[PDB]
Design a protein around this nucleic acid. Structure first.
Ligand SMILES: N[C@@H](Cc1c[nH]c2ccccc12)C(=O)O
Ligand SMILES: N[C@@H](Cc1c[nH]c2ccccc12)C(=O)O
Ligand SMILES: N[C@@H](Cc1c[nH]c2ccccc12)C(=O)O
Ligand SMILES: N[C@@H](Cc1c[nH]c2ccccc12)C(=O)O
Ligand SMILES: N[C@@H](Cc1c[nH]c2ccccc12)C(=O)O
Ligand SMILES: N[C@@H](Cc1c[nH]c2ccccc12)C(=O)O
Ligand SMILES: N[C@@H](Cc1c[nH]c2ccccc12)C(=O)O
Ligand SMILES: N[C@@H](Cc1c[nH]c2ccccc12)C(=O)O
Ligand SMILES: N[C@@H](Cc1c[nH]c2ccccc12)C(=O)O
Ligand SMILES: N[C@@H](Cc1c[nH]c2ccccc12)C(=O)O
Ligand SMILES: N[C@@H](Cc1c[nH]c2ccccc12)C(=O)O
Lengths: 70, 71, 70, 71, 70, 70, 70, 70, 70, 70, 70
RNA sequence: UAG
RNA sequence: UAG
């Protein structure tokens, strides 16, 4: 329960924060839809070993800040 | 019990701080409602592996500060 | 017993520092009332995985300082 | 025995440093009274998961410094 | 679930973030395709011990920032 | 054996460095008397979970420096 | 899975990133060929205890940056 | 064997670095006499949970520097 | 597999990065030859507890940089 | 095998670096004599929990630098 | 395999880096000869708990830099 | 002010 | 001042 997390703020409506499955298989297991201004703070977990961000969003991680673009 | 935590201060009435379930399923298990000025300090836990904030709030984490402005 | 803690100083009478239960359920288990100037230094624990502060207070954590308002 | 600790210096007589019980119950298990100028350095422990300071005091923790104020 | 991760932002359509297999074999097990502006945040894992980036992308890791231009 | 420790230098004779008992009870288990200028460097232990200093002394801990006053 | 990693960006075609075997024996187990601008982010692993770069590349590690010359 | 240590340099003859017993009891188990200029680097251990310095000495610990007087 | 590593860049042909055996015996178990411009990134391992560099090379470690000379 | 170490450079002939026994007893178990300019790099260990330096020497530890005087 | 290490560069021919035995006994187990310009990077290990450097060399450790003299 |  |  003490894994790294990412912070995502939607800069438009309809931002998708997609969790990709951990393991031999890489598939979507959940897409969280964010409207403009909403903030998601999401860890890496047993089930999520990669996170894809689609849409305009501001992203903070341990490694710095970045914006995704639509 | 020594997991990371976030600090959330409501900037308006009716902010929701939503805990999303850890595991194969991603659903809401609790939404804490905050009125303007209230502060919630919340950990990641066995049950919560993601936190969604709806409404205007000031947020502090290990990675910096940010404001939500959804809704 | 080495988990993080938060410091809270009341800036008025009747501040409430509320422990929310750890686990599948999220309810109050204790509400600590602080009068003006009193300081509480409180850990996250087996029983408390979130803390809610109601009333005017100065708060320090590992992530910075912040004030709660009424 | 390597838990965090707090430093408290009394700025008047009759300062109370109160240990609150770890566990499902939250009650006092000890109040250490300090007279002006005395310093207490006290850990979080199996028995103590929150500490309340009543009266005027100067306090140092990992997260900085703060003064409690008395009535 | 607390391994390092990398941050990749596609700078053009068709970027490939390729996971190379951990172990005695070094083959591809997944290629994630990114459209311009999308961000992928990907850990090292049981199954992934090297990552290859094809296409123009901006990359953040623990050791600094870099742009691929393949 | 790697617990935190405090440094105490007596600034007058008869300074008392008091170890308070770990556990459900909080009583004195030892008081070390220090003559002016003597330095004591004392750990937290199985037996000592709080330290009280009585009399004028200069104290260093992980969290900074402070003087006790008599 | 939390071992250190190296970042390598080829500055010309034909760069080789060579994994040398962990253990009593030291031999090549894999050679990854990189075309100009491509980035490889590669861990030390059960199988790889040393990495050789041939050809012109820019390298980032925990200890700073360096360029190989081919 | 990776506990904290202290560094003590005698600034006069007859400095005493005293190890106080770990445990329910607090007594002396060893007093090391140092002559002017001698340096002792001493850890906390299974047997030593507090160190008292008597006489004029310069002391370095993790928490800063200080001098004993006698 | 997360032990320290060293980075070595040959500044001339015929540089030898020599691994010395861990254990009661200290012997050579591998000499890696590096030509000008090549970079070797090498860990301490089960089998290697000391590394010797012969010839002109630039070296980065945790403790700073240094050049060997032929 | 990763406890703290100290660095001792002899500033004159006949410097003694003395390992004092870990445990209930504190006695000398080894005296390493250094000639002027020699460097000894010495860990704390299962056998050595305190180190005494006699004679003129420059000493580095985690806590800073100091010279012993003869 | 993740203990501290030292970096030693010979400043003249005939430098000796001497590993002293871990344990109750302190003897030589190995002397590595370095000629001018050679670099040895050597760990503390099961067999080596102190290192003696004889001859002119430049030394880097976690605690800083120092030069040994013949 | 005990060792 | 031994290895
Ligand atoms: N009972 C919840 C409390 C909680 C912690 N963090 C949260 C964030 C959002 C909502 C609820 C929570 C839990 O242990 O997980
Ligand atoms: N139930 C999901 C929640 C989650 C965490 N991080 C995510 C990133 C994206 C999507 C969902 C998530 C999980 O525990 O893995
Ligand atoms: N008995 C409570 C005491 C406590 C710790 N942190 C708190 C925060 C708020 C309220 C009470 C507490 C517990 O161990 O969990
Ligand atoms: N016997 C108490 C001593 C203590 C430590 N920290 C405290 C804070 C307040 C009051 C008492 C204490 C305990 O071990 O928990
Ligand atoms: N299922 C993959 C997801 C993944 C993580 N990091 C990656 C890097 C590249 C491609 C896929 C991935 C894994 O657990 O390993
Ligand atoms: N025997 C005591 C020694 C001690 C350590 N720290 C102290 C602080 C005050 C008084 C005595 C002590 C113990 O191990 O706990
Ligand atoms: N299958 C290889 C992949 C790899 C990781 N790092 C490398 C460096 C060079 C070459 C291949 C690799 C391994 O797990 O070891
Ligand atoms: N097979 C060797 C590879 C190696 C690692 N570090 C080295 C340094 C020098 C020479 C070889 C190596 C080992 O695992 O130990
Ligand atoms: N034999 C003592 C040596 C020692 C370590 N630190 C000390 C401080 C003071 C006096 C003696 C010591 C012990 O292991 O504990
Ligand atoms: N075989 C020796 C190699 C070695 C490591 N560090 C050294 C320092 C000096 C001499 C030899 C060594 C050992 O494992 O311990
Ligand atoms: N055999 C001794 C070697 C040693 C390490 N550090 C020392 C300091 C002084 C004297 C000898 C030593 C030991 O392992 O403990």
């Amino acid at each position: 329960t003490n894994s790294d997390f990412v912070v995502i703020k939607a800069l438009e409506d309809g931002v998708n924060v997609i969790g990709l499955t951990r393991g031999a298989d890489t598939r979507f297991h959940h897409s969280e839809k964010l409207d403009k201004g909403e903030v998601l703070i999401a860890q890496f977990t047993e089930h999520t070993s990669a996170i894809k961000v689609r849409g305009k969003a501001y992203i903070q991680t341990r490694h710095g800040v970045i914006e995704s673009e639509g």
